[model samples]
Each structure stands twice: as C-alpha cells, then as structure tokens.
Target: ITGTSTVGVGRGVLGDQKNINTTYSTYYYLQDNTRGNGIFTYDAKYRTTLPGSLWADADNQFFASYDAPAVDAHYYAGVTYDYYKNVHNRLSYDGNNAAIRSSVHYSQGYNNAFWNGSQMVYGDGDGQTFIPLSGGIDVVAHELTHAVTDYTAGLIYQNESGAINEAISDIFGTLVEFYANKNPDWEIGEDVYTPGISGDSLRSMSDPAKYGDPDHYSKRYTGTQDNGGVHINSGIINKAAYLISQGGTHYGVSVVGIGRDKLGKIFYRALTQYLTPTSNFSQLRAAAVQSATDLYGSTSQEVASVKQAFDAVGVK
Candidate 1:
C-alpha cells in the first residue's frame, strides 16, 4: 500500500512501550519504509495461512494485548536488518534492498517460528512453553538469520551442514542480541522460552551441555532424528563460536578470547566467502581459520584462537 511513512507508538509482548515505523495508508499499517525497501509485518490470526494481512491500526496506537507480537516482530526485524547492514555491510538478507516480511500469531498453540523460504512466521505459544516468539530479540534474529544463511552459504539442512547452519543462526542471533545491547547473554530464546522457568533457555552457546546439547564433537548426536541431529549437534559449533568470542577452557584445552567484533568478522567472512552447501565440521574449522587469516594475519592471535577454539571443541 502506498502511504506516507510515519511513526507510531506501541507496546511489545514484554509490555514495554516504543515507537514503530508505520505507513499511514487508509489505516496505520505495520509497513516500515525505513530499512532496506521496507519491513512489513502481518497478522496470522491463529491460522495456518501465510502473511495473513498487513497489520492495520485505527489510531496509530497499538495498545491492545493482541497487537504485542506484531509490534515486536516489526521492531526487531528492523534491528536485525541494522545489524547486518551496519556491522557486516550487507543490505538485507540477500545483500540487496529486499523487503522484509513477517507474520505473528501463526496458529493455536503453535510454539515455534521459522523462515519459510520467503517470509518469517511466528507462533503464539500455549502460554506455558512460550508467549509470543517475536518477543525475544534473539528469537527474531535467529529466524531472520536463516534467511541470511539461505542467501549466503546455502548450507544444506542435513547432517554436518545442517548443524553448521543452525550454529550460524545461533551465533548471529547472539551477536545481534549483543549489538542491541539490552541485557544480553549467550543464551538463546531465554526471553520468550518458558515464561515461568527462570534462568533457562532453548539453547546456550556459552554452555550447550546445560540443555543436554554436546559442547564437544566427540559427544555429538549420531541419531537420524532432527534431520540427522541438526539442532542437537549444533552445540559443538556453537561452543566453538562462544569460545572464540568469550574464551573458555574445556577438557584442559584453553582458548584466548578474541572478543565479539572479530568473531563476527571471521565468521561472516567464512560464511560468505569459504563455506558451501555440503561443508562439514572439519571444513568449517578450515573456513574459520582461513577467514581469520584473511581478516587478520595468519600469525595473528585471532587466527590462533580460531584454531584453538576448534581444537578445544575437537573439531579437527
């Protein structure tokens, strides 16, 4: 819809008020024409359909509880967009100014969210396991990073490649969380995961074993479930990334922390330049090592830590 770009006030799922970029067509629609081409959010209306309807507001004031998910989805999409553009020098997920789209309230007790190849879909959980998936910035970033991965490495969603894909999403999600700089941590989905369970998250990059995920390659899941343990085995890669950013020792192997910015630089370089669809764990280590060498010298501490992190995780 064509309309003048405007700002609207709204409360997110967390009950915090903020301004959202909206378009003033017939009604205030959640079409932010600020980042890239636009950031459009829609209402799924508790159905299985797609980007149901562009969220429309009567007075440009989104105060109703029903509007919370859409509010965060739209707002957080912009933040994720900014993260890639400003930090990584990438436009949208495609490196072109493509319009970003999302839909909230996907189904009755859906309890999940995903990037369905074209647009993002968020679920309003059963109120116990989750509230609204978009409420967590990390959740939003994790889903959007799938689009990034899809356009970049195009890593296959199976076996080691699938695990790398999942770890990449987790890595960037945590990076975006830290970039946003609001009570950041290495835990994924803590904000919207199990509203009643305190100090728990869907996964932890800092300590994947906290949730039964293997932090070392030797302990990786070997079952055929979950697309060859894509989600389960991602722990090994996630632990390596965490070790690179925030150094840690495991099984007597230690890594010197290279901080967050360099970690993003190296990983971003590897994902865009060196990785392929069928790349596996050892290949990922080589890509990371090469990426660090490309960004910093081969003898740089960044490269050494990249090697040590992978070695600590038993990747090579």
Candidate 2:
C-alpha cells in the first residue's frame, strides 16, 4: 500500500494512552515510516502464523481493548529502536537500520513473546498469568536484543553459551527499561506478569535466587532441561551485571558501583568485539574484563569493577 506517514492515538495493554506511528494506505496499517527502513506490526489473530496481515484500521484510532497487544507491540518496538539508536549509536538491531517487524495476538492463551531470528512475536497471554507481553518495554527490548546478539556475538543457545545469550538479552532489557524511565527496576516482566500477584516478575536481576535461579556460578543449574538452564543460569550473569552497575556484597565479595552507563558500554563492547558462539562463563569474565580495560584503560576503576562483579558471582 502507498501512503504518507501518519500518527495515531492508541491505548496500550495497561490502558495508557500513547501515539503510534502508522501508515495511511487504503487503511491505517501498523507501519511506522519514521524510523529507519520501517517498523511494521501485524495481527496474528490468535493463530500461529508468521507476521500475519499488517494490522489494518478503518480509522487511525486504536482504543479498543482487543487492540491493546498491537498497540504496545508497535509502540514498544519504536522505543526499543530508539534506545539502540540514541544510546548505542547503533541504527537498529543489525546496526544497519534493518526493518523491525512484529506480530501480536499470536495463539489463544499463549503466555510468551519471542524473536524468531527474523521478526518479533508476542502472545496475548492467558490473562491470568499475563495480559499482553508487549506491555512491558523490557520484554520487547529483550526479544529485539536477541536480534542484536545474533548479529554480534552469535552466542550459541545452549549450556553456558546459552545462558550468556539469555543474560545479554536480560541485561539489555533492564537497561532499556531504565532508559525509558518507566517505573524502572531490576525485575523483568513485572508490568505484565501475574496480574493477580503483586510485586512478582518473571525473573529478578537483583535477586535471581528468589525465583530459583542461580545467583552464583556455584549454584548454577546443570540439568539438561531448558537448554541447560539458559534462563536459570543466566541469573548468575544478570546478578553480576546488576552489581557492576549498582554494586553490592555477595558471598562476602563486595563490589563498588560503577553506574549503568558504564556497565552497558563494557558489555556492548564485549559482545560486539570479543564474545564468540561457544564462549562460557569464564570466557565471559575475560571478555568483560578486556572490554572494560579497552574502554576505560587497564588500571581504571571500571576495569576493576568488572573483574570484581564477575568474581563476586563466583564466575572464576
């Protein structure tokens, strides 16, 4: 469809009003021409198809309850794109402003969202456990960061490597949450997880063990399930990242706070410059150490803090 760029008003999953970028073709489709190449969102219509029809609206208004998922998915994708561009100076997930695409309302009662190597997908959760996952900016950033990781580190999704991949997404997700300045916290998925339960999240970067995830390498899950506990063991790295940003004592090892901006720089450098597909925890430690050293000098406090954060988490 050919048309000019336009803005539309919409209410997100949490009923928060926001303006979304849309394209005026025959109808308003969830295509944002404001960003690089473009950002396109589609309606999966409770079916399991990839990038269903580009969401169409007779008018530019999108306030219907049924439109919540698409609204947030589209809005949050723009926000995530802004984060990478403004903060990292990267154009897009691929650093080349590749078109960002997402599909919402995927599968009835589905309870998750993911990046399938090509585009993003969000589920309209069962409503008991989750509303619509795109409501959480961190969730959206988490999945899109997977695209970033794929293009950069290419970290294999299994065992320690897999845990690192998951941790990378979680770290960037939390960073994006803070970047957006929306009720920022170290918790992930709190905004859209377990509507009935208060103060609970899908995972916690500050205290991963509260949800049975390992906060230390010693406590890491070694089971074969969950791709060798990719989500579970990622807690170790997540906690280390949190400590690097906000410092704390863990297992008698105390780290000095270096702030979030530096933490992101170090990790981004490590991911883009050093990490390989099969890199493990110890290797991750080295990558971070070298990355900090490269960015802040070999003897800088930032380098020391990266080393301490890894050591505190028993990643030696």
Candidate 3:
C-alpha cells in the first residue's frame, strides 16, 4: 500500500514504550521508509513459515499488548542499523545501504533467534524461559551482527572459526548495548532471557565461566556438539574482549583497559580487514594486534593492550 511516513508509539514485550517508524497507507505498516533503504517488520503468527505478512495496524498508534514483538523487532532493527552507520560508518550489514527486514513470532514456544544468512528472525519465547527475544537490544544486535560477519569476515561456523564468529557477535552486541546506554552491561540477552529467573543471562561476556563457558583457551570444549562449541568456547574471546575494554586480571595475567571505543575500533578493523573465513584463535590475536596497530601505531598502548588481552585469555 502506498503509505505516507509516520511514527507510532508502542510498548515492547518488556513493557517499555518507545516510538517506532511506520508508514501510513491504508493502514499503519511496520516499514520505516526513513532509515537506510527500508526497514520492514513482519508477523509470523507462530507458524513455521518465512517472512509472514507485513505487520498492519488500524491506527498510527500501537498500544496493543500483542503488537509488542513487532514493535521491538522493528525498533531494535533500526537501532542496530544506526549503530553500524553512526559508529562504524557502515551502510548496513553489507555496507551497501541494504534494506533490513525481520520476522517476529516465528513459532509458538520457540526459544531462540537467528539471522538465517539473510533477514532477522525472532520468536516469542516459551514464556517459561523468555519473553519476546527481540525485546533484548543485545539479542537483536547479536543476530544482526552475524550478517555483518558473513559479509566481511565470512568466519566459518565450526571449530575455532565458529567460536570467533559467536564471540564477534557477542562483543559487538555488548558494544551496541553500551552505545544505547539502556542499563547497559557486558552481558548478552539479560533482558529477554529467563523471565522466571532474575539477574541471569544467556551469556556473560564479563565472566563467561559463570555459565560453565570457558574464559581461557585451555578450557575450551573439544567436542563436536554446538558446531565445535561455537557458543561455548566463545567465552575465551569474550573474556579477552572484556579485558580489552574494562581491564582485568585472569589466570594470573593482567591487561590494561583500552576503553570501549578503542576496543570496537580494533575489533571492527580486524573483522573487516584482517580476518579470514578459517581464522583461528592465534590468527585472531594477530588480526586484532594488526588492527590496533593500524588504528594507533605499532608501539601504541592500544596494540600492547590487544596483545595483553589475548595473552591473558591464553589465545597466544
């Protein structure tokens, strides 16, 4: 429907009221014509289908409780888009101003979200474990960053490369969370994870070991499950990233904090320029150190910190 641009107010699944970009034609559609090329949101209606109908609203306002997932999915997509553009000078996941799209309510009792190598897909969680997965800003950014990784590093999703892929998403997801400054921390999916439990998250970058994840390379899982422990072993890199930004002593090693901005720069540069599809932990250390060297000379503290952080995590 040929719609005019408009803004709609809606509450997220988490009960946060935020303005959403919408279009007004015959009805209010969750399509933000202003951001990038376009940001479209769909409602899956709890079925195993692809890109359900574009969400439609009778009024420009979206106060209905059921519209929460669509609201947050659309809103968070925009925030992630703005983060890449404003912070990293990226034009979208592809750095080509590609239109971003998302489908929410993917399946009843679905408990996870993913990027699917194309558009974002979210599920209204089982309610026992989570609410709407899109309600978490970091969750949204984490899945979207997969697209970024696919486009740039193309990190293979298995073995060490896979762990690096997962770690990259967690790292940037946390950065995007901090960029938004909404009760931010170095944790992932804390907002939409475990509604029945308090102060718990899907993963913790500050201390991955809290959830039985390895914060050191020596402890990495050697099993074939979870694509060679992509999600589990990511803790190693996550810990290194945390130490890079926050500074910490781990395994008797210490790293000086280089702050979030520098950390993002170094990692972003590594992801886009230095990494390969089959890059391993040692390769990643080299990539990050080279990235820091490119941003702040070879003899700079930033480069030194990158080395120290990786070494602290036993990556070197």
Candidate 4:
C-alpha cells in the first residue's frame, strides 16, 4: 500500500492525498464546496490562538486577525525607503540589502509608536488628541531613524548621546518632510489624524517654536517631555540647521548666504563621514564646522553659522 501511495483515504470521500500537509491538500480544501474550507484558511493561520482584531504576521505564526498594514503605514515606509536611497544612497536601514517592513495599527489603541530592532511598529492613537500613531510622516521617519542610530552610532539611550540620537531623527525627519515638498513653510502630520485635529502636527521644520504651549526654546528648556525632553532639546539643533542653511535666525546672529541644499549636504557629510560614534555636542559642532570648511571654504557664512548656532545652543 505504501509502494504506490495513490489510493484515496476512506474511499476518497475527502480527497485523494498521500499526505494532508501538502499544498495540493490545501488547494483541494479551498476548492471543496464546503463551509469548513473557509474556516480552514482562518484556522491555518490561527492555529495557536485567535487575534481580537489585529495580529502580527509571523512566519506562519498566529496572532488572530493578523494581516498586512493598511494605507498609511505603507505610505510612510515608502517615503523612508526613497529618502535613504535617493539622498543618502543607502539601501535600507541596515544597508544589508533588505526591504523594510512597517506594520501599523499594532495592538489595540496603543498610544505611542516605536521601532523594534528590524521593523517599525505603530499603535493606533486613542483619538482624543491624535489618530493612529502612523499619522505623522516625521513621527514615522523619526521612529525609523532610531533603527538607523542603533545600527550606526549605537548611541546610549540616556544622557547626551540619547538626546543627540533623538535630534538626529528630527533633522532627517524634517528633511524628509521638506524633501517631499520644497515648501518654504513646512508642516508635519497634516493629514493622518481626524479633521477636528487635522491641523495638529508632530513637529515644525521651519519653526520649532510653534510646537509647545510656550512654543519656544530657551536655556532653561531642559529636555523633559518625549522621553526626558528628547523632543524639546531637539529644537536647538533643528533651529541651528534651519538658521544656518536657510539664512535666518531667532535669537542668534544671521549668516544669510548658504542655502538649504548646501546646508543639508554639509551637515549630512559631517554626521555620516567625519564624526565618531561617541560624538558629543561639542564634537558634533567642531565636526560640522570643519565639514563646512571642507565643503565650502574657510570663513564662509555656513561655517560661521555652524559656530554661531552651536554657541547659541550653549554648546561651545
């Protein structure tokens, strides 16, 4: 009987099969004119347990209703993919030749969004102040950049290193927002949330002062919110970049000649090429100045703004 193994089991009432685990069996079950077949596909992916509404699609693992992301998650992931490839010439987060996967609406009504080691994870906002956490491009970009920081600087998640890590994400996140459109005044997260809070944004690229209640950065800023003020202290760096490249200033002197593109090229070079993994504020300042000198020339407006902005941030 085992030699041929072609006989139908139980007189072939179910279907002819040597093994029930084969793809052919699945196909037969799918084609079987029975309601149980519909239940089988669901059970196949849901063997261990059932998902309430959503689930992570592990390697044939069950999470309950686990499925691919909806529209917003897919869009944000594509933006990050393009920005890395076009601006930085990076393949992906690891640069190890792998496509990135961003899963949105992770868990039920989760408040915050975060990046796991490999893929980006997002939660659905409770809808009082925000919508799904994937609602903002820069927020999405910022989370993904954390993955990049882990791969590169491996900066400690506390103290100045962590602040710098967070700041780095803001820099690129704002840049990605700008890169999407060269609008003189850029607004982040204008679409993802609901209409009542539609204008509510994550960050301001042109002006960081518009973010908080007081809506400005000061010496007493003290990074406190967003994981020990990672979000607040970030304004200093963002402002410095904006003031230097865009030829404007808030409280600092103006260095009005270098344009945004030039600013981006210089800063990107310093961050990626010149600086070490343990670069501090002073180190980043000096490296950026040196980089500006290399890219432009000594005594150039860009180099000077790099100096002035850092000084304004109390770095120098």
Candidate 5:
C-alpha cells in the first residue's frame, strides 16, 4: 500500500518480545518492504482460502494476544530469509529474492503447516495437540525449506525422494534454529508440538528411533500409505545428518563429527548442484560424498565422514 518502512514490536505466541518489519500508511500493515514483496502475513480467520488478508494494526505496536502467531510468523520468515542470504548467499527460497507469503489461523483445530509449492500456510492446532504452529522457529523454517527444495532439487513428494525432501527440511530447519540460537536442539517441532507435554517432539534427528521412526535402512517403511512413508523413512537420512554434525556411534558404526557449518555446506552443495527430483537414498549418498569432495577435496576427512555417516545408517 505504498507505506513507509517502520519497526513494530510484538510478543509472539511463546511470549517472546521481537521486532518485526512493517509498512506504515494511515495504519501499520504487517508487511516487510525490504525483502521483495517483503514478508507478508495474512489471517485466514479459520478458513481454507489462500492469502486471506494483509494483517493490519491500529497502531504500529502489536501486543494483542491474537497478534502473537502473526508476529512470530512474520518475524521468523525474516530470520529465515536472513539465514539463507547471510549463510548460503541465497537471495530467497528461489534464490532470486522471491516474495515470502504466509497465512496463519488457517483452520480451527488444525495441527499442521506446509509449503504449497508457492507460499507458506499455517494452521492453529487443536488445543490438545498444539497452539499455533508458527510459534516455533524450527517449524516455520522447516516448512519454508520445502520451497527451497522445490526450487532447487525439485524432490518428488513421495517415496524415497520425498523422504529425502523431508529430511532436507528437517536438517535445515534444525540448522536454522541453531543459527538463531533459540533453545537449539536436534529435535523437530519440540517447541510447538504437544505444548501440554514437555521434553517431547514430533521427530528426532539425533535419535529418530526414540519416537518410533526408522534410523536404519533395514527399518525403512515401504507401505503405500503416507506416500510410501515419506515422513517415516526420512528418519534414516535425518539420523545420518545428525551423525555428521554431532558425531555418534550407533550399531557399532562410528562417525567423527564434522560440525554443523560443514554439514550445511556439504548438503547445500549436494542439493543445489547434485540432486534431482527423483534422487533416492543411494543417490543422496553419492551426491553428499561428491559435495564434500568438492568443498573439502576428494580425499578429505569431510568426504570420509559423509560416507561413514551414510554407511552408519545402512545407506550403501
């Protein structure tokens, strides 16, 4: 709406005070005009439509209880944008500063979020399962990384390729959480999933089996449901990533940790330059080894660790 750039202060769903990017005209609009279309937050008002309405405020301040989810959704998008641009030198999800869009309060008692191949959509969960999905940075980053995957690898959203896609999201989402240094852990959605329960999450990269997900190739699911276990089998790849970043010994397989930055570099390189839409676990191993080689040399320890981590997970 041709508004001037201004800063707005708000408390997010988790009651965290954060500053967000907004545009000021006659009133403040939930638009960040610095990033492309910048960051735009909308309210679905418990409907299933796309991009409901640009959030507006009577004043430039946002402290209302209902504004919490929008606050974090918008703020976290900016943080994710900064993480990509600053860390990977990526402009945006498309690497060209594409507009970042999101809608919150999507459906009553809804308990999920997703990247619809174009923009982000969030749902308010049933009180028993979750509060607002956007309240968690990892959740926000995870969904956004799906778009990055779509633009780069274009990984198919089913079977082995879809598992890789999901793993990639989990990996980068965890990385982004650590990048922000906000109660970082290797668990996904711990902050927002099952708020009534403590010390639990939807999935665990460090130990997927802790939540009944497969951490080894032999345990990979092959059923047609859940798109051939896209979410279920991703645990294998997620375990490998965790081993590479943190170092671990599992089932007599030992991997020397290479740290998170290198993990990101190797994976990002593989994703951008090596992976395809149909890449599977074996292909992912080759791509990761090649990426580590490209970054650290053909005979470097990083390459060796990548091989070891995958092998440790039974991904030969």
Candidate 6:
C-alpha cells in the first residue's frame, strides 16, 4: 500500500520522538465518529489506569496512545474492521455485534499486549529495547483474534491447544498485515523498534530459515518452547496458508493464491465453525479438506491446492 498521511502524528507536544516513557496526566472521553471511514470503534472503557492515554476527542473515545500506544491502537482498530468488512462482509470485531472498546498505555513498563476478554490493553515497553506492542496491524489482530478465539474455538491455552490458539492469531495477524496491503516479508515487530538496533520480528513466516529454523515440519519436531513451540511450529500452518494464497511450489509443485477473499472465508469459517478447542493438525486437515471442498468443490484446483499444501506440511 502506498503511504498515506491520514494517520496522526504522536500526541506529545514537546516533540513526538522524546515523548517515549512519559505517562499521560489526564485522559479524555471520546466517541468513534468514524464518518463512513469504515472504522467503528465502540468506546474507551478504561479498565485500568494509564497516564497520557488520549481518548479520541471527537467521538467514541477512539483509543489513542501517547507514543506507540495511540497509533498502534487506532491502526489496529481500523485494520481489523476493514479486514472483516472488505474480505468477509462482516462488520466490527465480532461480525454480528456493535463495535468494541479498547484501552491503550495500560501499565507502566508493560512489555506484552493482551485482549482481556472484552477490551484491548497495551503496555509501554521497558524502553531499553522494545516499544508499544500496538505497532502493527498483525500484532493488534493477533491479540484481538484471541478474543475471537475465546468466542469461537475457545481453545484452552495449554499444550497443543494453546499452541493452536497462538497459531490462529499469528496466522490472521500476518494475514491482516497482508490484507492491509503491507509488505509480505513475514516479519513482525519491526514498526515500533528503533532501526538503530538489530530489530527483527518475533518469527519469520516467509522463510523460516531466515530465523535459522527449518522451514518445513519434521516428525522429529519437539515441543520445547512457545507452548510446545506453538508460535514456533505455527510457521508450518502459516506457510501452508501463505502458499495456498500465493500459489507457489512447496513439494516440487506449484501452488496459487486462490484469491485472498476465498482463503480468508475458509479460514474464518473453519476457525469459527469447524474447529473444536482441541483441534489439531489432523483435525485441521480434515476440516480444511471439507471446507475447501464445500467452497470450491471436490475436483477444483483450489481444493487440490489446499489438500496438497496440508499434506506437504505433514498435516495428515
């Protein structure tokens, strides 16, 4: 996507660059007032105290961060809404409901961002290395997709189930990035960091080898880190989905993009309707085979691509 100046500059007055780590002394209330922008944020229900967090002054208390918190939150809200509306014909966060609330700049020196059942929350990083987690659409989508998961598969956050939870979010998170027409370099966390340091994403989906890890799945795969390496192993599914979209070679054959709209529908439908809390790779394969067949037909090339991608990844 080409650059646009619509996004707001940092809310600090002394200079946006130097405003990092400074807390808000006051918080204001706002309404969404999206105005046909396709952005419909619910409200700014502040669950916790965060200094310097600016509620959108216009309407709907549109959540904003002082530094990264403001920009990241607004960016995510816009991206998430746009994704559902543009791709799935769904509106707002839940597809069948009004907009939802968000809170930014949640805690002092908070490193990780989370969607706590209802609203979204953010933390200012420790400031030695990281920035606000609301830096990208994917990370925002990643956390909010967890809320979607809680409402859908309700996958338990332990073992393979937890890995699946993380996997689903990352998959959609990356998709949101691409859906926003951002670079498909398969990296995360680049937007918020100072380029002065060797800033890289938490994982690599385009070429996992770039992270010095194997690109394909191995039966020898061990459950070590990332909830038995859920985030780590998620690369397998993410890559499979990517190939299914981009249409490229995986197992010595070509795959195709199959249209992002179609792929997004299949994924959203499968995750929301078909997948159970304990769904695994085998289950995903079966469900996807069914979903693809239903969406494209048993003999369609897209169906073949879906099944082939799954099998190539050792999903069976």
lDDT of each: 0.95, 0.95, 0.93, 0.54, 0.93, 0.61
Local accuracy of candidate 6 as per-residue lDDT tens digits, 145-178: 8877888878777655666677678777777888
Model 6 clash tally?
18
How many clashes show up in model 4? 3
Candidate 2 regions with alpha-carbon error over 4 angstroms: none
Looking at model 5, the pairs that clash are: none
TM-score to true structure, per model: 0.99, 0.99, 0.99, 0.69, 0.99, 0.76
lDDT of 6 at 129: 49
Candidate 1 segments whose C-alpha is farther than 4 A from its true place: none
- lDDT digits (tens) for residues 80-116 of candidate 2: 9998899889898899999999999999999999999
Q: Each model's RMSD to truth, in Å? A: 0.6, 0.7, 0.8, 12.3, 0.8, 6.8
Estimate candidate 5's alpha-carbon lDDT, on a 0 to 1 scale. 0.93
Candidate 4's C-alpha runs over 4 A off are: 1-69, 182-188, 193-195, 213-227
Ranking 1 against 3 by lDDT, winner: 1
Please provide, for model 3 over 246-310, each residue's C-alpha lDDT reduced to its tens digit, 9 standing for 90 to 100: 99898889899989999999999999999999999999999999999889999999998999999
53, model 6: CA deviation in Å? 7.8
* Residue pairs with backbone overlap in model 1: none
The number of the candidate with the highest lDDT is 1
The CA lDDT at 275 in model 1 is 97
What TM value does model 5 have?
Answer: 0.99
